[PDB]
A paper describes a structure:
In summary, our study demonstrates that [name] protein would function as a purine nucleotide dependent R15Pi enzyme and not as a homologue of the regulatory subunit of [name]. In NMP degradation pathway, R15Pi catalyzes the conversion of ribose-1,5-bisphosphate (R15P, substrate) into ribulose-1,5-bisphosphate (RuBP, product) in an adenosine 5′-monophosphate (AMP)-dependent manner. AMP acts as an activator of R15Pi and in its absence the enzymatic activity has been found to decline dramatically. Monomer of [name] protein consists of an N-terminal α-helical domain (residues 1–122) and a C-terminal α-β-α sandwich domain (residues 123–324).
The other catalytic residue, Asp204, reported to be vital for ligand binding in R15Pi enzyme was mutated to asparagine. However, quite surprisingly, a clear electron density of the substrate was still observed at the active site pocket of the [name]-[name] mutant protein. The interactions involved in holding R15P in the active site pocket of [name]-[name] mutant protein are equivalent to those of the [name]-WT and [name]-C135S proteins. The absence of electron density of R15P in the active site pocket of D202N (D204 in [name]) mutant of R15Pi from T. kodakarensis led to the proposition that this residue might play an essential role in ligand binding. Interestingly, the [name]-[name] mutant held the substrate at the active site pocket indicating that the residue aspartate alone is not responsible for ligand binding and there might be other criteria that govern the binding of the ligand. Therefore, binding affinity was studied using the mutant proteins, [name]-C135S and [name]-[name] in which case the heat change would be solely due to ligand binding. The analysis shows that both [name]-C135S and [name]-[name] proteins bind to R15P with high affinity with equilibrium dissociation constants (Kd) of 13.8 and 10 μM, respectively. On the contrary, the [name]-C135S and [name]-[name] bind the product (RuBP) with negative ∆H value for the binding peaks indicating an exothermic reaction. The mutants formed strong interactions with RuBP with Kd values of 7.5 and 7.2 μM, respectively, which corresponds to the binding affinity of the substrate.
Numbering used by the authors:
A (entry chain B), B (entry chain A), C (entry chain C), D (entry chain A), E (entry chain C), F (entry chain B): 3 to 324
Amino acid sequence: AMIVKEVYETAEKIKSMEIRGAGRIARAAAQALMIQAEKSKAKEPEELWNELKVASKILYNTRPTAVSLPNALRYVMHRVKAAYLGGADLETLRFTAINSAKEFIYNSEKAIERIGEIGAKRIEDGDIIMTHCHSKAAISVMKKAFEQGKNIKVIVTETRPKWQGKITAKELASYGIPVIYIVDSAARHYMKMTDKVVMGANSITANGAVINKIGTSLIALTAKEHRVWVMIAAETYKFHPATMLGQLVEIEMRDPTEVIPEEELRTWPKNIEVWNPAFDVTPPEYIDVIITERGIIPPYAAIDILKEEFGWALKYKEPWED
Amino acid sequence: AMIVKEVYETAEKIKSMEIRGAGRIARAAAQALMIQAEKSKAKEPEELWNELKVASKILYNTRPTAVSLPNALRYVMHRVKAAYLGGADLETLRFTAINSAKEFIYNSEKAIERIGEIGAKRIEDGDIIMTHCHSKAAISVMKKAFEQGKNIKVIVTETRPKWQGKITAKELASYGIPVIYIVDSAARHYMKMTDKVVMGANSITANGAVINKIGTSLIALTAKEHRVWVMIAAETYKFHPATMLGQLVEIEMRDPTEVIPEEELRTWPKNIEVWNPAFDVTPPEYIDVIITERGIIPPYAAIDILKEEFGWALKYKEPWED
Amino acid sequence: AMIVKEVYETAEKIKSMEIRGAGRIARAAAQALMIQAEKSKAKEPEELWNELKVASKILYNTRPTAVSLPNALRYVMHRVKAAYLGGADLETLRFTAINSAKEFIYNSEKAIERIGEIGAKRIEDGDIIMTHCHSKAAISVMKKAFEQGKNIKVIVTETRPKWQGKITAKELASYGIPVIYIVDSAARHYMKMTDKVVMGANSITANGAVINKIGTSLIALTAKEHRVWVMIAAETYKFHPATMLGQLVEIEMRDPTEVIPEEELRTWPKNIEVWNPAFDVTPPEYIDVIITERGIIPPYAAIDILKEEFGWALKYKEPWED
Amino acid sequence: AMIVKEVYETAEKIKSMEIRGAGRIARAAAQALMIQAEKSKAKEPEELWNELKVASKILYNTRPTAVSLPNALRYVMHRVKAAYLGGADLETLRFTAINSAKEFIYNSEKAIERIGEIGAKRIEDGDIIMTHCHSKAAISVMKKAFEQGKNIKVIVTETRPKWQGKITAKELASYGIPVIYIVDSAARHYMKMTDKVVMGANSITANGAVINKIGTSLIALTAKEHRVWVMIAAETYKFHPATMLGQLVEIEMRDPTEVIPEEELRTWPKNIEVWNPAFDVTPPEYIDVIITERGIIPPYAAIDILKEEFGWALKYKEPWED
Amino acid sequence: AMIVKEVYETAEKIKSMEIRGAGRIARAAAQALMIQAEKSKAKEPEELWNELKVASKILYNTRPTAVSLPNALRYVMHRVKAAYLGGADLETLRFTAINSAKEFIYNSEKAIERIGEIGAKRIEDGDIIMTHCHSKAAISVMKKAFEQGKNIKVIVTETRPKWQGKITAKELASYGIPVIYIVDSAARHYMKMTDKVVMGANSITANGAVINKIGTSLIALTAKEHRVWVMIAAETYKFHPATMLGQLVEIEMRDPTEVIPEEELRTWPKNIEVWNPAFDVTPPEYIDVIITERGIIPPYAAIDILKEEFGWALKYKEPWED
Amino acid sequence: AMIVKEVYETAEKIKSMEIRGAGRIARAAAQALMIQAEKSKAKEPEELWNELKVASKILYNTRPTAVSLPNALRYVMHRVKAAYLGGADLETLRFTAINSAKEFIYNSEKAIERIGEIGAKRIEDGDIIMTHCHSKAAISVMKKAFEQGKNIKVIVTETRPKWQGKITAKELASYGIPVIYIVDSAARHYMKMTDKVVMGANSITANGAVINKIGTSLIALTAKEHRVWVMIAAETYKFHPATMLGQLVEIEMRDPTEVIPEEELRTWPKNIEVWNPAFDVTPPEYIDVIITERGIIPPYAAIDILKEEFGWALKYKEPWED
Ligand SMILES: O=P(O)(O)OC[C@H]1O[C@H](OP(=O)(O)O)[C@H](O)[C@@H]1O
Ligand SMILES: O=P(O)(O)OC[C@H]1O[C@H](OP(=O)(O)O)[C@H](O)[C@@H]1O
Ligand SMILES: O=P(O)(O)OC[C@H]1O[C@H](OP(=O)(O)O)[C@H](O)[C@@H]1O
Ligand SMILES: O=P(O)(O)OC[C@H]1O[C@H](OP(=O)(O)O)[C@H](O)[C@@H]1O
Ligand SMILES: O=P(O)(O)OC[C@H]1O[C@H](OP(=O)(O)O)[C@H](O)[C@@H]1O
Ligand SMILES: O=P(O)(O)OC[C@H]1O[C@H](OP(=O)(O)O)[C@H](O)[C@@H]1O
Ligand SMILES: [Cl-]
Ligand SMILES: [Cl-]
Ligand SMILES: [Cl-]
Ligand SMILES: [Cl-]
Ligand SMILES: [Cl-]
Ligand SMILES: [Cl-]
Ligand SMILES: [K+]
Ligand SMILES: [K+]
């Protein structure tokens, strides 16, 4: 199959986290399919179909935990597969991939904006907000509250080992928002002064559990301890269909060298193992609301988002499997 | 007063944390007073007394949170003061300073060994133990358990910002103990597999609260959530006399460049502030036992350790005050 | 612009709490619109439409916290607006107003009676029930259980500052129900002897939170503490549509002279402020069920009441807006 | 009515628990109605209808707690009733009873297999699973997990007074699964080593409460204390329609001689009473998921299973009532 | 038998709550014994002894719940009794009564002032403090913190039924302290903004439980809920010796007309009963410290206050008994 | 060493649980030493000393978990050892053993009575009390409350696998106390109607934990859940000195045949293991008071009982070790 360099490059950058953030990697994967379809030299629809299946698989095998990625792939590929199977000729199949890809990307952008608008209404003037990692959905919320003239301040946790909190701090400061920057260990110490916790998600399960950057569950735990609202900002495509039928979400284990750099780590004795999970699981008892582009829900309503929008696909195999 | 160079160097090295760990700095403070008295060229008792008073103030004004330091200074100087007020001559005042200091150091050392023998009886073969920062008292426990032939493994949290966890990981591994190194954020995620948590202390208050390295209270919180025993290995000189009469323990705020290196921080926007608390407060509800060199106590027995060993001094001014 | 005196006097009575209780004020707003329409001297549809809009705004601007009042105005005005926009003539518009009003009013009465029947089934012979304030929906439950022959006693809390508890004590006693009357402060002391807690609601949010008379949340908290069932009796029009898109519910602050009479308060010094919140927020974790005219639900299905009945309307502006 | 012998024998055998387990008795009840219709010597539709009505009452008055039984009877008799009221002739009424019953039995069987496939995805290699009583739905899960090659061990609680745990221990062991048998009292003691708890259900209520074998709520409580996942494997026909409109589930009180054998009890003093509740109530807070043949749900989604499959019948009388 | 009118009128005033507050009523009982002794017309030791015994019984039988009152009578009477039994003459006995009284009175004043000083050290600049009722010991803390220049505000709960909150609001405002006055029901709504809770005590038991004005326990509960410090300010003579040997503390039930004035209550029907408990019980789990004149203790060291100061006396009968 | 048959027989009966109950086995062990000393044919003190050491070891090696046993042995043997070592002749050594044994036995009887008197004061008229196993200390409490004329009723759990609850039921009924008898699984179900939980102890540790019959920890857990007082009735000799220095208490694992009788168990396949722990650990957070013969303490004061009465012996080896 003649896979274009952009598919390989997108995949390499997902894997390396040069491109990162759950929504962003899903957009990048839709983009990569778009580009495969645009540049394809396929002459028959079967051949293009085969390229899009192979590209889809390469992109799926990058990072496991964030379901946004497979959900993007499926959005495009369910539509591509129904067209190929319904007889579409080459150019109709091509357009179906391109246009489906574009709709995913545009829907992602609008969803993040609307999550901002909805979540911002829950932020009040004077609020100290704590956040974790770098989530564009959570940021959209903070950014909009500040645009509305609420004087907020945000406690940003540094978020080891990849330091995504540095991204968040600089970003929020560039909008005019003051930031207090702390190490992850200090989240309980500062939870007394916090009014709200606003974080994002990689995958949300059928029972309401949120899988998000390593340490999220700790911040949620002590927020609950303190009666501080935990709000999770998350697009519908963050919801995980396979968990409706019992599937466990895989937690990505990333290279030990993100924790201890290579040159240091290679001097350490062999009876030290460095373990580097990229996510943890926050149970729904520690989440007050999830803010989707369709509104505020209790986390227990995750199953409804899943039923009404993804359940249908579960009797069928993946729309890229041959 | 003619303060010797070793007093100034010890003070600087406590301040910079080139010498750190609550028991160690307390021994170093006693050791500094020892050297002042050894080397003093005083010829009157009054002169040496005044030197030791000034030295004591220099040493006390280094780091505020660990009461181990003022307790060491008190141990030497209650004895020095009483000899002086009872009319000791120069050589008798001198020997009293030098010998009180050697006593403190020796008792510290024995206390740590003993804490280890006691706490190790609580550790069971097959145990996975989580720790935090680098506490000689907590290490004493684990090391003794390993030497008893218990096949243990220790999960070492990196302990941002100063990375004391690397000291711990390499020290335990060099004793032959298997280590799992993780970031602080991952403590909840790995609390299910943990059997025991063993951590140290800087100060322990009358109501049974434990002031220890930033992040301690989080680890304890989730250990309690998961019913994992929290054990705090701590010498009786970690107990904080002044909290008996209402005093709050100052939490040390250290330099922002410990979090974000100077070269990076100078480039960051002015509306970002970096907060770097060196300690937090773990309430007694999240502590199962305190292991002193006198035995296992519930945390609410802290007031008894204080009543029996320190209460009598509270009537008086500090033994270095004019 | 030509608004009948009945609208003005209903408004004044809602505002002064001469007419109170969330259901009742909602019925009174419908009643007021009904009377504007019956008595209007308008000659074109336009004029009547402008009167109903204006009258609705007046009624809306009385008390903010109970969503029943705007849900009643919406019930009428959606229907009036649709008729008006579909070119309805004057008597068609008038009667759409009158009839819609009557319909809300009759459904309110029936909903309250049906909540009685459903809720009474959870009451058991010998039950001691605690309640708070004076809620017709909670009272419907208690009255029905007693009419079924269950020997219950009701602990009535006095409900400062407006003493609604007195209304409830006398009302329940009038039906032959034995009453125990206590101050609000005594709710914990008597929670051990309580078998069920039954209270009303002013607004219920998308995430399952209940906004009800100041003090409800304390009762619910110690109820949950003691594993006593907390049941909230509430018509579907107590559910709050705007909270689906992030709106916060405003807590009415009423006159401090309801707390300290004017004659006494004028004598007090300026450095005492009296704060008089009329409602508090009870989180869903401390509510076992809501009893609506459609059934028993967990507090987390509030969002399904909203989606199924009100969600459609969030697309559009309030039906009384221009 | 000429009720056949198999109806009476099935009723007696449900009463005595020679046939027990909530799914099994439901199938046996359907199977009894099947045999009544097969063997009936009725010649009018009216006559067979009246037989099936009487049979249904006999079967329903056996054990009250497991709603699986009346749900089975409803499944057959809604269909029988509608055929009769629509003027079915004898053979058409007959086949409708026999075929509705075969459908119920088949769907039950498939539902259990499916619950097993789904729940098994939640079980992980190395898992220690605790169970209670003898639930075919819970066993389906464990058995499928074992057949997937997951090396599991099951802790089986003896389940006094009727000792259903011995049935479970021998059944699991005969599939090749390692078993640890303990007394019910030892469930807390062994909850630290347990990874997962998997139990069945007799009835599940609108608010998400689970009524299952006496002791269930205790096991769930301590599983929650210890953060051990509680999974309730339960077919949709375990969900209890009438709780939607307020009904409480009767807890069956069985004979004291199940606890203390007659030969011993007759010798005991008159001021000792033996209480033998066959079930308790586990609140939804102590349940992580319910595994239905339609998927994993949070317990608060019980109201949705009821709304979508059973709500419509609540308007009508039982389909066996005059 | 010859009891001076001062004893009778002190008793009547204690009983009617014209003299109230646990410390104050204790000082007034001592004062009453002092005056019996100064004014006695007895001529033998025997006669004075019989008067002091009788006068003590009268004073004891006023209000039951605050142990301060019997601890004051014991302070005097142990000393009088020992003197009398060691053959003291008339003026030796008289003066032992008078002097012992004066001594209790002076120590009470000093204890309250010392609690102020110790407790103020836990108050911090900017603190919002919630309190309940009117406790001189809690007020001592708040007043001292303000005198130290800390800018505090105090939330004062009204404390139905006797409105002690009004005494406290006016008193605190008189010292220049800003006050916020709320109904008791509003304590949860305002707990988020509260930094510390500071309340008094009537009796403290061997296990650490605090008996204080009706409603204290609800405040402490939601304080603990919100991780707000709960501090109890209480002299050593609030500790209850008889609870060491299992005694329960009696909860005074006062006249229902304190709740509903007579003029209104006579009009109410017989089937409403008004219950008026003057105190509730706060378990030690919801108290962080007790502040006594001897220091800060965890609530679980109440038993050590008792053993060290009162335990000796449990051997013998009350010193006023025959 | 010439060990009398009574020592061997006492040991056999301890091991078999023909003699059982923590206090009773300690009395029986003191008795066995008494009898060895009375019947000894020793001619020199060294020879008698050697017999008493050997008997002590035989009795120590019966059952591990209840510390009452070693504490009895030590009470006698500390005194025997001080006499042998201080030169006592044969007959003085003999008398020292006999008389020390008698003092232990008499002190045990008085302690149980006094625990009754003290605990009974905490029981109120109308109380429903739940208990577990058969504890003479807990029974003394119930028996005395009933003798005082309190109308109590006791819920007795059957206590698998040895059925000690049958002993308790019959015993309490023989005093006139009504009993409700339940299986252990039903303790949560009936905790709503319970006022108090009163249980005994085998060993109480330095941190306040209570080791008691298997299932105790479960009853305590749900009692705490329900705000039902947990009272532990326990003699000072139930307190475990070695835990002061870190020792873990061994949990006795008894024969599987107590759970499943031999003839049944031998037909079961080898991949079923029966596990039969005789005790569990109840953490001090689930105990409100321990009632000793010296009074009511919080469980956290266990360390005080240990310090003041047993600490002294810990620098020395066991008084029977050679
Ligand atoms: O979609 P948005 O809201 O941007 O991010 C959601 C989440 O994705 C990120 O994962 P990673 O950094 O790619 O591993 C973080 O966990 C973050 O909270
Ligand atoms: O005395 P040891 O047990 O060695 O250590 C006690 C504690 O002192 C250290 O503080 P820092 O590194 O000096 O700030 C850590 O907080 C450690 O837990
Ligand atoms: O609709 P019903 O059940 O009568 O009352 C519901 C609630 O409305 C009342 O508010 P207010 O007295 O009007 O402020 C109380 O808060 C009461 O619980
Ligand atoms: O339907 P399945 O999953 O087999 O069992 C469900 C439940 O029914 C049984 O009740 P009983 O033994 O009939 O009283 C047990 O409580 C079991 O958990
Ligand atoms: O001793 P001080 O600190 O003043 O008061 C202690 C307590 O006594 C008062 O009781 P009451 O008003 O006499 O019933 C209140 O309960 C107050 O908290
Ligand atoms: O000393 P008393 O109060 O009688 O009993 C205390 C405890 O000893 C018993 O152990 P076992 O039955 O010998 O194993 C039970 O666990 C009981 O609660
Ligand atoms: Cl998962
Ligand atoms: Cl502090
Ligand atoms: Cl809100
Ligand atoms: Cl129910
Ligand atoms: Cl009490
Ligand atoms: Cl132990
Ligand atoms: K664990
Ligand atoms: K576990």
